[PDB]
Amino acid sequence: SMKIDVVTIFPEYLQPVRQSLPGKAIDAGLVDVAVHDLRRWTHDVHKSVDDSPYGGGPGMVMKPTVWGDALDEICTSETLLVVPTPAGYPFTQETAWQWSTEDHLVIACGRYEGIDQRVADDAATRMRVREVSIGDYVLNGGEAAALVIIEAVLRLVPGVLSLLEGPSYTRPPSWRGMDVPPVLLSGDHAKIAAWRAEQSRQRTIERRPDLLGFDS
């Protein structure tokens, strides 16, 4: 069993984790996902979680005090603290495999212009911390990234179940005048394997030449 805790100021945005495979993994008892409202750990009546950045700049930074209290309660020395951020190390398939064997993930979701760096620095004195980016784009908050990470990891957990995959087809064999590639209907496993390997390598050079060690 894995435990995943997600900490966020928008707990309602994490509801989709109840759908499809994360939902089915939860129902199978393979994982427990708990979502926590960061404002639970505030003490002012304003429940303030942010303030202006030292040194200037646009926007607001999440305060370390509130985060520290939340993580103190939720984390242990065995926790893997995951902090989604566009400035993170890349989260990849390899990362997903690695984290799939973890006992406890805590995902700290930032909003505004990010979380005071001392939160991660303080946590790293007690536990393993991983600041990660899920791709080359910016979001308003870490919540959607948390959903991506949870899905990519949970589908790899024992008991739940390079190159680009080429096109796939199913019935009927002809549709709107478009035919399924005849080799796929031929029953020749060697020819199908070869055609699929070729399609995979062809799609990869077109869409992801970087995966084969080429420019762009």
Ligand X SMILES: COC(=O)c1ccnc(N)c1
Show binding-site residues for adenine: 134-135, 137, 139
Binding mask 90-109 for its own copies (x = CB under 8 A): xxxx-xx-------------
What residue type is assigned to position 160 of the chain? V
Which one, 65 or 133, has the nearer CB to ligand X?
133
Q: Which residue, chain included where needed, has tokens 């370390």?
A: 64
CB of 104 to its own copies, least distance (A): 21
Which residue from 3, 47, 63, 104 is in contact with its own copies, where contact means CB under 8 A? 63
Give the C-alpha separation, 145 to 88, whole Å. 12
Give the C-alpha separation, 59 to 214, whole Å. 39
Which residue from 62, 71, 105, 129 is in contact with its own copies, where contact means CB under 8 A? 62
Which one, 1 or 162, has the nearer CB to its own copies?
162
Is 137 a residue that touches ligand X (CB under 6 A)?
A: yes
Which residue from 84, 95, 105, 106 is in contact with ligand X, where contact means CB under 6 A? 84
Q: Which residue, chain included where needed, has tokens 């973890």?
A: 102
Is 22 a residue that touches ligand X (CB under 6 A)?
A: no
Give the C-alpha separation, 84 to 205, whole Å. 30
Is 139 a residue that touches ligand X (CB under 6 A)?
A: yes
Give the C-alpha separation, 140 to 119, whole Å. 19
Give the C-alpha separation, 112 to 62, whole Å. 7
Question: How remote is the C-alpha of 108 from its chain's centroid?
Answer: 12
Interface positions with ligand X (CB under 6 A): 84-86, 110, 112, 133-135, 137-139, 141-142, 145
